[model samples]
Target: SMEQVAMELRLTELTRLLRSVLDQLQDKDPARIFAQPVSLKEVPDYLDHIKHPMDFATMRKRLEAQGYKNLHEFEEDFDLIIDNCMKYNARDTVFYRAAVRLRDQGGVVLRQARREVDSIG
Candidate 1:
């Protein structure tokens, strides 16, 4: 339990540090910090194209190839991407938000599949 708590604290600290760095960037040039506004209306189409069950399989294979032993390890990388996007207010692009939703859903699917596999064996 202590180890888990420590790990969570470390993750929080990392998030805060990242936020601080992004804040500096935003202060330096808010213009360049966010992408130019585009028609977020196409986010739905983009999401439909990007979100696929196969993405979970691909992610698993990629993680295994990279020596990841568990989903949590993979999640850390995912979290960083989402965290950075939030820090920079990338939500203006519907595509960014859609991508985040896709990733979140993909993570859920992967976790459920892993749990089922674990239960079987």
Candidate 2:
């Protein structure tokens, strides 16, 4: 089913995409303006890194350690991330301004799960 496949693949792709971007950015000058991780300054490099599937937990921790202080910071950096993931060579900074939309309300789902468990007991 599309739902199951998307659930599995979207996360896998997103993580892979983020990691690829980060790995490439590691060697470039830091995007001092945003105080982002050292791996996000160069667009080309960022795009090159996400060409394969990756581990989400590992990527999330690495980004967090590299100063992705929160979800906002993560979203702030998504421009270069998505551009590189979709198009081989995007030029405009437009993609940089877009935000990542959640496929489902994760926080709500977690809360509901907890409530359901409590009710069960």
Candidate 3:
């Protein structure tokens, strides 16, 4: 009974936490490369190289829709955004550097949010 009650608050706080997490990443993503989507029109072979693609624009909608069951679920998409960039762009490329830095900074945000969420439930 208490668990069910706490779960409601957990989700609300979790959503807020994820939003801020997204906000931080959004700020880190300069040039909007990570913010924009990869359609076939722009990068003809975008899907050919990267099987799965994710972006911040898509994330806000997913968060607004409350599609994430937990932080891990939210994290899957979170990691994909960086992983995709790392995979598609060469090691020496700008996007690759951006991805690495974004991951480094984003990890701290995720860790803090995770700790807070764990403390709650």
lDDT values, one for every candidate: 0.44, 0.40, 0.84
Question: How well is each residue in 1-121 modelled by candidate 1, as lDDT tens digits?
Answer: 9998976665555444333333332333323323232224744453343322222233334543543444465556445444545544467885456556645554555566457435633
lDDT tens per residue, model 3, 7-100 = 8777777788888878987777776778868877979988879887898889899998777778898889989999998889899998899989
- Once fitted onto the true fold, the runs of candidate 2 whose alpha carbons sit more than 4 angstroms away are 29-121
Pairs in clash, predicted candidate 1: none
lDDT, candidate 3, equals 0.84
TM-score of 1: 0.37
Scored against the true structure, residue 111 in model 3 reaches a CA lDDT of 87
- Ranked candidates (TM-score, high to low): 3, 1, 2
For residue 91, model 2's alpha carbon misses the true position, in angstroms, by: 28
Candidate with maximal lDDT: 3
Candidate 3: stretches off by over 4 Å: 1-9
Q: Give, for candidate 1, the lowest lDDT window spanning 10 residues.
A: 49-58
Query: Which candidate, 2 or 3, would have the higher lDDT against the true structure?
Result: 3
Identify the superior model by TM-score, candidate 1 or candidate 2: 1
Model 1 stretches with alpha carbons more than 4 Å out: 1-66
Clashing pairs in model 2, backbone N/Cα/C closer than 3 A = 20-49, 20-50, 25-39, 79-96
